[PDB]
Amino acid sequence: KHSLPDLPYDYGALEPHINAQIMQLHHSKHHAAYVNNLNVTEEKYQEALAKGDVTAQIALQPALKFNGGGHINHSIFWTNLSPNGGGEPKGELLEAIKRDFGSFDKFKEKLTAASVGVQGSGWGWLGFNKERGHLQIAACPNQDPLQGTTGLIPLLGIDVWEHAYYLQYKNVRPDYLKAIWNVINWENVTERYMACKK
Amino acid sequence: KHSLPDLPYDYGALEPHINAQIMQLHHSKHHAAYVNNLNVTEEKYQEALAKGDVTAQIALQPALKFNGGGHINHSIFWTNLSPNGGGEPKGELLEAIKRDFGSFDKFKEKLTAASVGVQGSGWGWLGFNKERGHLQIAACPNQDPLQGTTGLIPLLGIDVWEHAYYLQYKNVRPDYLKAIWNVINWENVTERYMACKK
Amino acid sequence: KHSLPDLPYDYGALEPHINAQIMQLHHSKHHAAYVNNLNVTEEKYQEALAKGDVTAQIALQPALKFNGGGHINHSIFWTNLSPNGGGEPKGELLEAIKRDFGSFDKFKEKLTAASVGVQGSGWGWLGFNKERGHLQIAACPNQDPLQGTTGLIPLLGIDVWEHAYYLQYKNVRPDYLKAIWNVINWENVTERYMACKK
Amino acid sequence: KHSLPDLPYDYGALEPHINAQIMQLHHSKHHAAYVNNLNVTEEKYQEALAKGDVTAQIALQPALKFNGGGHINHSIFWTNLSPNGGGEPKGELLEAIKRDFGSFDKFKEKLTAASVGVQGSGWGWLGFNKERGHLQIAACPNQDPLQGTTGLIPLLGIDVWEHAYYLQYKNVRPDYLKAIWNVINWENVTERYMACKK
Ligand SMILES: [Mn+2]
Ligand SMILES: [Mn+2]
Ligand SMILES: [Mn+2]
Ligand SMILES: [Mn+2]
């Protein structure tokens, strides 16, 4: 079975950057949608695998990636956010940011960059490229997962799907994206960071 | 130059199905975004064509389709909607619907079908397949145009991009999709229809 | 376990249309490659499913579709070919061809059409669209299966991957495509046809 | 007008690695195909741009990228190959290879890696990522150009489209890929390299 994470703060705790109406729905109506369909599909995909049924296995695949990836994209997100989060990453992570984007503000535009240009629905990502032992920004389509689709390890991800900001910023994706920095829980983005080791 | 169509009714005129806050923004902040970037890109793409510069031509391509298709997808949409629109297509169009989906409610389910399943951002489409002289439902990704990407002729399209319903239906795409029928200006969907001739 | 079909004729039996060097390799070196990797992957995909491991499940997906689809695309192919095959489809199938493409020669160009324009590697397909009870030509990318990716039922498929003709027609895909008609086992393309029933 | 480059050696000059039957056809029948269709399409695309005809512009797009990118992918290729080419990149380029893949054999494996895994038709690429001032291996689909589609600068590319090796290595892509090293004209791959400057 797969289950919906409780988010590490109330809905309320990310005001004013992200309002609680958006957190209310992102977690409960949105993320829960994916977990449940992940479950129905994975269910169906251990049945069809078992029969060796390669066309219904291939047919259950976009379903599996949308909800699969939609479950794990949004599960990393809540953790990347926190009220006593925010500011700039201390220590090691910061230094890697410095070593790879030149400076934290250069790193910040480079990620607003990726995120603000997702044509349609998708995500912006600060990832880790462990074959090259460095940071790496990537943007992903729909709920297409960073590691499931590129092999890069997710440290920080930004949802730019309209359901993530619209009820608040309306058409202005980059306003959302500016608010977002203030709740970025660098203490966890670092934990993910450290996990990766050279 | 490309210019933003005025929509054929005030924002207000599609209440309660689509509220005027949504119409206000879809036309003004959203569609206008695409026209203007269409223009900057087409500008740049007659410069680079002129230099025979095939890599910057290929680079301006997703930009051109997003805003190109985003301009023409949304320009057909306003025309497919009207207050004294709605109900059931009379005459010829209805009959083709009957001949191709069996009945208008079978046709309606088949198009909610397409639309409600757009993984991510995209559109549901009642099109015309002129190589086979019949109707044809198609769903398109992002602002990927029906005829620019499939050759099918657009008669009726439904935006299922979240920016089309979210401020009102929130996570409930199919509620939007049920409201939508009541403003469907069949008189124009028919005009597009007739244009196609066998 | 998945196993390689024996092909229903010797390599030799499709001369001169397709030479036996090509049949030798298509079946033995090519198709067998896919079956074996289908097996290793499906193996790995019942392990990771079992652990509920959604990122390695999503990572095994292009592997599964390439070899999955590559196994079932090529398994339908051999059956669509035969020496005492060829000519035009008798009875019902022919009539559906007449009803959907106007005539067998109109149907033949419409399928050379699809096949000859596969940008890169892929397949041309005479399929069945069972939601609309009619024939339907479709072209698929790489070893992307007709029914696994579109829901259409495969009656006749043409490989236009270069490995299918190159050792013989070299750069001339459409020469291959003309030869191909002469070995088209219409007796089986019909059996697939009939299976579909309205 | 666009014109076919003469290749910098006779067909013959890359034996035994790539045979002259393959060079004969790659340059003459294959690359020439793309130049000519580039030309017809670019022609049509300055007509339709001129009329502001956004759906026929979007329709001429896959045509333009296939032949556009197919023209420029194959034009860089001939230059990356030479008889008095081969071996090990001297100086600066070598050092960047050392700095980015650890060693030239690690770099070689990493690029056979990319190339040998192109599902279907495509290319493996040693590129330059000028926003990060370093080397970067990328693999591209069909004739999808490195810089036109990723912004990375092409220094060395390997065609793994079957038309590049099949008449010689048949199903064995990696044999082709091993032969390939021996004709790699490092003197030019370096010139492209140096052009990029930090
Ligand atoms: Mn989301
Ligand atoms: Mn819209
Ligand atoms: Mn094949
Ligand atoms: Mn080539």
Curated annotation (Swiss-Prot), chains A, B, C, D:
Binds 1 Mn(2+) ion per subunit. The modification N6-acetyllysine is found at residues 44, 51, 90, 98, 106, 178. Mn(2+) binds at residues 26, 74, 159, 163. Nitrated under oxidative stress. Nitration coupled with oxidation inhibits the catalytic activity. Acetylation at Lys-98 decreases enzymatic activity. Deacetylated by SIRT3 upon exposure to ionizing radiations or after long fasting. The keyword Secreted does not apply. It catalyses: 2 superoxide + 2 H(+) = H2O2 + O2. Its main location: mitochondrion. Homotetramer. Belongs to the iron/manganese superoxide dismutase family. Destroys superoxide anion radicals which are normally produced within the cells and which are toxic to biological systems. It is linked to Microvascular complications of diabetes 6: Pathological conditions that develop in numerous tissues and organs as a consequence of diabetes mellitus. They include diabetic retinopathy, diabetic nephropathy leading to end-stage renal disease, and diabetic neuropathy. Diabetic retinopathy remains the major cause of new-onset blindness among diabetic adults. It is characterized by vascular permeability and increased tissue ischemia and angiogenesis. This is Superoxide dismutase [Mn], mitochondrial.
